[PDB]
């Protein structure tokens, strides 16, 4: 999976 | 925001 | 491919 | 920054 961190915000797709 | 486009997903933070 | 776009920044991989 | 892991690739703006 791709893996997005924003600063606290974390998402995986 | 933060866009990343993972095929049909666009994550926005 | 992945599409990130941070603000006026862009790249894809 | 922000970081987006695309397997081996780790973008980071």
Redesign the interface.
């Given at each position: 999976a791709?893996?997005?961190?924003?600063x606290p915000?974390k998402?995986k797709?």
């Open positions: 791709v893996k997005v961190k924003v915000t998402v797709v």
